[model samples]
Target: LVHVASVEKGRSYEDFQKVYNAIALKLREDDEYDNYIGYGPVLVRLAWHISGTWDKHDNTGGSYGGTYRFKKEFNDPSNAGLQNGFKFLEPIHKEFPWISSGDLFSLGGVTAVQEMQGPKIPWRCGRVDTPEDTTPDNGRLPDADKDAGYVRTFFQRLNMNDREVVALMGAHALGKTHLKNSGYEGPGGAANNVFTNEFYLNLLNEDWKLEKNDANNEQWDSKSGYMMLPTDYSLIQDPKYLSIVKEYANDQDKFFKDFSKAFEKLLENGITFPKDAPSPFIFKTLEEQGL
Candidate 1:
């Protein structure tokens, strides 16, 4: 039940930076994906879904085990649209086969966030792949049709507090949800690919109408062609979640910082790091590198 951090044989920060650069370069080159939204959003979602399976009580499912490569986890109904992200990483994995699945998957999220002009997520280079049986069963992820109470309760299993829940859901500002993927549809805001606090802003600012989509699922829609899942709208509905939502909506830097911390914690759950494990690496974006 204990998963210790193990750097890949002969791999270090520089090697992982090369892998990151490859993922970032591909993210830039593959501009036509998701109707020009690029691979960024789904990549973030893939990392979230892969890591979201963690259970703090038992530590059975988490990013520590790269079990998402297994069939059950890959074909998870909750993971419907994430195949795109996985496909995007296939080439990078082939090129640098030493990176473990958990590290590569989580690193994809970090790269996608930074490449899209988000925050710098200090990433570690461990996460050895666990066996297929380690893949957590389906239904561990949250459902979109639920409310604020459901959102809070579900995230409890993942050990996310109110602020962490609100901050992490900021990722909703990225990709649009496909009806085929999760019985939900539409983008949360104008900036679909860029990471922002728009999810909080839109949640507070939009005059949303509860309507049924083509999937016959209820979502809060705005005249501006944006939408919010019931769970997303619940942030504003709940008093406590509403406070953090408003805070993030007003302060972008604070959102970026809190999100970086919460996200890193979310991905690192269920894994133990040795006292001597190297410090987390803060990678430079392609723009920062002048690439």
Candidate 2:
């Protein structure tokens, strides 16, 4: 199943820009959620989980389907805390009903990253909503458990390499693992709502101990109140992932650049962009626009 992008009829950068503005504005207004981490981190996580379903082998599940809006995908055990992000996008969806569900879902992530002062992500507007049958079964997304080998093997389905995998995992810095959501708990960093290389920094710097949670799940915890899933800790346990993690932690600019490229690629998985399609749009963040 080749997933062709169906660019919305008669829509352009400005139209999507308006949608982006709405998301950004709400990110600011809707504070005090999840202990004031606000909606930015979860929005980023929502976008990642939505796009992460892609299986390059057959191209069956991906962000193009917008199937997350469907009951099956919406209720995915893997997507537990994401309802907050989905509800956050509901008003914007109603306002710009022309945008495809996939596009809106993925773009909410772009808006969240940029609005929170991360790197600029070049985004295309064209993921047409696929039918409910196109929804990939649950359990396609990566598990937070297991080892370095599992971490490497899981992302292979999406065709990501070592660097790309590490860069993408850098996003863990932005969000927390809610015990109710993922059977793990605590913020990934003090700057949980902000985008940074802190995930890598904490992983490398913090003295973490393996402990079981109330859910009886094993995760690494620190005195600083940050936590790392087994898969996240797998980075340092593996030689290659550790090298990349060190590189990202050493230079913030390099991490931002690599993460921007890998993230854009992650969002575009299973998408076949037409030759005549317009270039990706880089919407100005509210801060960049002095708004």
Candidate 3:
């Protein structure tokens, strides 16, 4: 997973900015999904799922490999609902065939976050695709049914500390778990597409009850039609996690800053940048360019 840095041949910031705009424009154009939740949340999820496989202990299964293009990684059960995001990006990939799969996939998450008003996640481009044999096994991703200890242990493989773990989970605010997808259902809040501390706010303020889904799996539910996975609820159950949750809920700016840092880290895990590599690129959102 330690890939030597090599720029996409002849490609530069303008090339990537074009890719970013395609993703952003399509995000606005594709509005008939999830009650108009659009593709933003799932794209964020796809990006995370693509990079979430990194194991800092060995540097395997991160986004740098771009193995998701192969069947084994593409068809992973944990990736069930992500084809929507993948398909959404298909045309962009076709249009910009020179962009490596790793770069495009990771960039989609960065674009989705900024377009949704979450935060500016500085991104770099160096991931090159390797063969299918490099893909990680099916179960490397964490289970949603686990506890606080499990959450901590799971992300440790990605080298994330407590603050980063809490910040990243705030992404749950953007998308709901589908019953057919993850055996859990319901959005985290009314603004399911916007990036906010609403996930933290909902966690602290809601009257959540333990309930079983149609699939006979247990998850925390609320009367307001919101839901939290066992792991999401664990943030408040554990003293360390609860304090971070409170901090994010009380100050929106702090959550954005922390999330921006952690997300960039998550996306870059297992890749090596040369000492002379440029500083991370902060791509302008569609709004910023007046598009």
Candidate 4:
């Protein structure tokens, strides 16, 4: 056995920064994961799905374990096309094998968003790899075909309240559900690669109709070639969700702050940060490298 004293490289904030660089560089190279559309959104979604498994009560699952790198977790039906997302990070993972899959995968999501001009996602370290048995069962993820009640009940297990649920769903603005990937079609916004309060705006301002995609299944659609699940639409129909939706759509800064908090909370679920753990690391984008 290789006996070690302390961990060596990629264990500090600076080391993780290099991992971020490798991922940002590859995202720069991969010009076509979704028809040359770049790998940004899917990576974000991958990170989202991985972290979404957390159950608030037992704190059973989340991005903290990095177990999604395993075969069973990778084969999850909700994660069908995410194999490509893993493929995109394979090189970076190889470069920094000492890093936990949980850390690398979640960091890839943060880097992609910041590099692509989205909000800065503050991240932490220290996720150990677990076995296939530790992988969360597939059905724990959100349902594309369900309503707001389903969304609420589902996230309830995840320990997110209604406000947190609505804010997290606002991230839908940055990606679309592929008929091949999610059995749903159309993006959620005009600027699918960038994060904005557009999700809240669309939920409130647009007139949508239930329509069928090429797969011949129906979903809520708007005039912009964008789509929202009925459950997403339900956020506005309910007075409680509608109030918060309006608040976010009108104030971009508040939305960003809340999104960053809720999203980070999603990733950190099920993992405890020791009181002595270092502060969250905020890496500079490549553009910031010029600074």
Global local distance difference test of model 3: 0.90
Ranking by lDDT: 3, 2, 1, 4
Clash pairs, candidate 2, are none
Any runs in candidate 3 off by more than 4 Å, and if so which?
188-191
Candidate 3 lDDT by residue in tens digits, 1-291 = 367767888878898999999999999999888888999999889899999988888888888988999999999999998999999999999999999999999999999999999889999998989988998899989898888999998888899999999999999888678889888877635647888889999999999999998999999988898888999999999999999999999999999999999999999989999987767889999999999
The global C-alpha lDDT for each of the candidates, from Candidate 1 onward, is 0.89, 0.90, 0.90, 0.79
For every model shown, the clashing-pair count is: 0, 0, 0, 2
Model 1, 169-279: lDDT tens per residue? 999888788877788877634547878788888888889999988978888999899888888888888999999988998999999999999999988998899998999
Q: Which 10 successive residues of model 1 have the least lDDT summed?
A: 185-194
Top-lDDT structure, candidate number:
3
Better of 1 and 2 by lDDT: 2
**TM-scores, one per candidate:** 0.98, 0.97, 0.97, 0.92
User: What is candidate 1's local distance difference test score?
Assistant: 0.89
Q: What TM-score does candidate 1 reach?
A: 0.98
Write one digit per residue (lDDT tens) for candidate 4, span 175-290: 56777877787763354666678888887778899887787777888787778876788898778888999999999888888878888888777776666677889999888886
Which sections of candidate 4 miss by over 4 Å? 1-10, 188-191
In model 4, residue pairs whose N, Cα or C atoms come closer than 3 Å (at least 3 residues apart or on different chains), thus clashing, are 32-36, 66-102
Worst 10 residues of 4 by lDDT: 1-10
